[PDB]
Ligand binder design. Structure first.
Ligand code: HG
Ligand code: HG
Ligand code: HG
Ligand code: HG
Ligand code: HG
Lengths: 149, 774
């Protein structure tokens, strides 16, 4: 119900990834709780993709979010449920049904924002999100664990 | 967020105020604003010389601050905790900001602990510290009814910076304590009491000074003053109302930390800034005739002797201000907000104070009263006397029946003193004056005295609208068409009626004697009937009843009938509650609904199943219809006491309020949701109404006093229509309680916690449009 300002433009589309394990079927509800605790009036992402395949809508598509910093003012963030091994580190264990969802969403967004560029948080951050080589998954349906791409 | 130099900055404010209101004024505004940090050599010399309180404390203080400055510097091995802090601050300010703050703080008959007083002064020194340059320069720009509001035309170097202080709380305390010390030694102004706390005593010397004699507080004004040119429209969350770039910005919302304040930044909500800003443009002026009286009249146990010694410094602080702008054709007041919504006026002297302040002020722009005006003016002045329970028709009369008495008050001091005998002396005297002038220039005069009106209760109102019950919406006196009658009284009859009824004629449920022997008036079944929030179910009626009528009757030996105490109270409660639970049904219904969402929202996941099933005890938030977000998060404090034995003698070891590393307080968190929500509403109704009465009916001047607002009599009649129509527009355009449902539901645990209370059933209320006279 709370409304946020509008981005004067959309230049990037980032893919991040909760640090949740394959046994946690979390979603916007749960991801928002974290954030409320992280001190925020609402979830910082625009869309989030459940292990299921379901694309739950977060903040309004065209709204300054809280996802990729120093970049929030102009981009859409997408959090992929999953991305951490059963007690360990980054592991591209996303579901194939969850990857097709991201595929169609991405085409749509990149078409509706001519010029907009597809990126990854571990491309501007010392962290391992989305935890996998994107450009490889994008250009080849090959999904590999990594912190590059 | 710095883009331009420390000069363009010291430019824009002046160069915009000059291009705008005019050049003489552009310099009167800032000049005035800088009075918060330093007086000035100009204002001081023409004051000191010209008169060959305040030319005493200032000279002696700048001294100590200079003696000590280098005394330390003796270049020996130890530097105190406040030296580099005080050092690049010009003591010119230091000694002032210290005299100026210490008196302001003695205003509070509430708290005046070395810790408070010290920390108060502390915060200031820093503002100066961080803005001492942009200020010093901006000054050089020179030597020591226009509607100036704009919505974009502000140069992008007027857009508020950091409102929050950076210093550590401890530090802030040492700096303040040294200024406080140097104050006592150079000028024996204040002294410590009950040493081992209270810095509030003023030596018996300056004490009698301020009260007794002719206007001493001359050069000592409040840290926050009224403007002499339209405030600045807000946008963003800091730096509004005021202009001076050489100062510390204000904050849209008064928060408990920069972190809390910072969560509004990204929030989009037009109506809030429209409201705040409309309320800010209202032009005002001093009511000199009332001032003329107050000027003279104000000169003519242990637990209530403290207020006497403090209400005096406040009287003087606000009679020094009223006189100060007594001639200005007009004046303005920048405004702020609560974390819950409320709009508060920044300056100490404002239209929201005791009745003397309320009377010393008046709208500076009027319309011809005419028939209606003159009527509502009457209704107004009745309420001003105290005749506000009885109905309007017999309300008017009281006035004509006293025609020649009001007029007689055409020689206020000469034995009129009648007005002084009214509930609110000056909030009334002003009335007579107004009354008189109508009776001399006719229904043609552009009168402007703000007429305010308060309602029996707002909340029992919105819930009745929200839920759509009649019986109660009509009980309040304001929802549908009826003949104004109080609810407080209505709940009385039902109490008594029941008493006799089946108490006598039906343990000791035979208390219908103890009470009937004492009397059950509307003055006993009302304190609780208005506490439908914090004070709650019958249980809350007991301690209030027991605290207000019973116990205070035994004290004077007027309750002999009440053999057994508590049990008496508890009996009435059952009666008050059953009577309310019938008079205003939806209000009680709506309140349980929340008392219920309150259990869930602030709970901790109840699965013991041990797996992906946890939900931290966290914050609870919600949004009002105009878009304003409310964040409630009561934290248990984390602190560690200090040690200070600095005044030679007297060891003091106060507790540093907190250190900001807290964990929730599940009690408050739950018991604070219903009430904070209702206050939250009042806020959002007001704002909405003000915007609506400025567009729909183009009203320009708004007076807002403790959630009662009024305009000039001319417009008085339209506010009402404005109010009535906003309520309607709200609860017709959607189901707000259904929305709040979803709003809360959204903050729970998957489904585990989705054990939400069913929304109360709506009733049948005449077509909302029935709410208005039509
Ligand atoms: Hg991640
Ligand atoms: Hg204070
Ligand atoms: Hg009044
Ligand atoms: Hg008048
Ligand atoms: Hg009330």
């Amino acid at each position: 119900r709370v409304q946020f300002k509008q981005r004067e433009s959309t230049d990037a589309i980032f893919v991040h990834c909760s640090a949740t394990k394959p046994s946690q079927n979390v979603g916007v509800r749960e991801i928002r709780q974290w954030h409320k605790e992280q001190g925020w009036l609402d979830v910082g992402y625009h869309f989030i993709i459940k292990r299921d395949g379901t694309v739950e809508a977060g903040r309004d598509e065209m709204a300054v979010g809280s996802h990729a910093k120093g970049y929030n003012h102009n981009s859409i963030g997408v959090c992929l449920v999953g991305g951490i091994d059963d007690k360990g580190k980054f592991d591209a264990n996303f579901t194939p049904a969850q990857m097709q969802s991201l595929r169609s969403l991405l085409v749509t967004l990149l078409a509706k924002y001519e010029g907009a560029v597809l990126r990854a948080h571990h491309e501007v951050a010392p962290k391992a999100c989305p935890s996998f080589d994107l450009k490889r998954w994008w250009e080849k349906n090959e999904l590999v664990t990594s912190d590059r791409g | 967020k710095n883009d331009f130099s420390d000069i363009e900055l010291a430019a824009i404010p002046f160069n915009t105020l000059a291009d705008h209101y005019g050049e003489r004024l552009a310099r009167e505004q800032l000049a005035l604003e800088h009075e918060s940090y330093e007086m000035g050599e100009a204002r001081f010399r023409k004051m000191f010389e010209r008169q060959l309180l305040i030319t005493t404390l200032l000279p002696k203080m700048i001294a100590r601050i200079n003696d000590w400055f280098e005394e330390v510097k003796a270049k020996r091995g130890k530097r105190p905790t406040a030296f580099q802090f005080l050092q690049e601050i010009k003591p010119e300010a230091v000694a002032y900001i210290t005299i100026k703050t210490t008196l302001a703080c003695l205003t509070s008959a509430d708290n005046t602990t070395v810790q408070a007083v010290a920390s108060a002064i502390g915060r200031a020194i820093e503002d100066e510290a961080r803005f001492g340059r942009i200020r010093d320069l901006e000054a050089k720009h020179f030597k020591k009814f226009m509607q100036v509001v704009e919505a974009d035309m502000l140069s992008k170097g007027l857009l508020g910076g950091e409102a929050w202080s950076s210093w550590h709380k401890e530090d802030s305390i040492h700096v303040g304590v040294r200024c406080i010390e140097m104050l006592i030694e150079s000028t024996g102004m204040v002294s410590l009491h009950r040493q081992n706390s209270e810095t509030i005593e003023l030596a018996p010397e300056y004490a009698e000074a301020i009260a007794t004699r002719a206007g001493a507080l001359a050069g000592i004004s409040p840290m926050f003053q009224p403007c002499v040119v339209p405030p600045k429209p807000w946008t963003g969350i800091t730096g509004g109302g005021y202009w001076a770039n050489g100062r510390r910005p204000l904050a849209l919302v008064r928060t408990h930390s920069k972190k809390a304040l910072m969560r509004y930044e990204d929030v989009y909500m037009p109506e809030v800034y429209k409201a705040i800003n409309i309320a800010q443009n209202t032009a005002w002026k001093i009511n000199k005739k009332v001032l003329a009286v107050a000027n003279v009249i104000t000169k003519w146990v242990y637990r209530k002797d403290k207020a006497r010694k403090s209400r005096r410094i406040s009287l003087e602080f606000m009679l020094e201000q009223a006189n100060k702008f007594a001639n200005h054709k007009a004046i303005w007041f920048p405004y702020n907000m609560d974390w819950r919504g409320r709009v508060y006026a920044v300056s100490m002297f404002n239209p929201q104070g005791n009745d003397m302040t309320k009377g010393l002020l008046t709208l500076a722009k009027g319309k011809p009263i005419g028939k209606e005006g003159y009527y509502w003016l009457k209704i107004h002045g009745a309420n001003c006397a105290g005749v506000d329970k009885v109905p309007f028709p017999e309300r008017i009369k009281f006035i004509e029946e006293n025609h020649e008495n009001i007029m007689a008050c055409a020689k206020s001091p000469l034995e009129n003193t009648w007005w002084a005998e009214q509930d609110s002396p000056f909030c009334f005297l002003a009335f007579c004056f107004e009354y008189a002038g109508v009776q001399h220039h006719g229904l043609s005069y552009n009168c402007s005295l703000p007429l305010a009106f308060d309602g029996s209760c707002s909340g029992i109102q919105h819930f009745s609208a929200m839920l759509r019950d009649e019986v109660g919406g009509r009980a309040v006196n304001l929802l549908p068409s009826e003949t104004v009658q109080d609810i407080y009284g209505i709940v009385a009859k039902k109490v008594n009626e029941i008493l006799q009824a089946d108490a006598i004629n039906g343990g000791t449920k035979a208390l219908a004697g103890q009470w009937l022997a004492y009397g059950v008036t509307r003055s006993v079944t009302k304190r609780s009937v208005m506490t439908l929030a914090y004070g709650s179910k019958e249980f809350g009626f007991r301690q209030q009843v027991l605290e207000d009528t019973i116990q205070p009757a035994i004290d004077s030996g007027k309750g002999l009938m009440f053999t057994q105490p508590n049990q008496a109270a508890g009996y009435m409660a059952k009666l008050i509650w059953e009577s309310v639970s019938v008079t205003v049904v939806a209000a009680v219904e709506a309140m349980n609904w929340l008392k219920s969402a309150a259990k869930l929202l602030a709970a901790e996941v109840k699965d013991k199943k041990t797996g992906e099933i946890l939900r931290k005890r966290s914050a609870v938030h919600w949004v009002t219809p105009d878009g304003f977000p409310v964040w409630q998060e009561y934290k248990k404090p984390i602190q560690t006491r200090l040690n200070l034995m600095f005044l030679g003698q007297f060891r003091l070891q106060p507790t540093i309020n907190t250190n900001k590393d807290s964990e929730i307080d599940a009690h408050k968190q739950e018991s604070g949701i219903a009430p904070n929500f209702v206050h939250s509403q009042d806020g959002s109704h007001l704002r909405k109404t003000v915007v609506w009465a400025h567009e729909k009916y183009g009203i320009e001047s708004f007076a807002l006093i403790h959630d009662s607002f009024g305009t000039i009599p001319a417009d008085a009649a339209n506010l009402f229509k404005a109010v009535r129509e906003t309520m309607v527009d709200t609860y017709e355009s959607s189901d707000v309680l259904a929305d709040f449902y979803d709003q809360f539901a959204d903050q729970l645990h998957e489904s585990q916690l989705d054990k939400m209370p069913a929304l109360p059933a709506k009733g049948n209320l005449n077509l909302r449009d029935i709410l208005e006279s039509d």
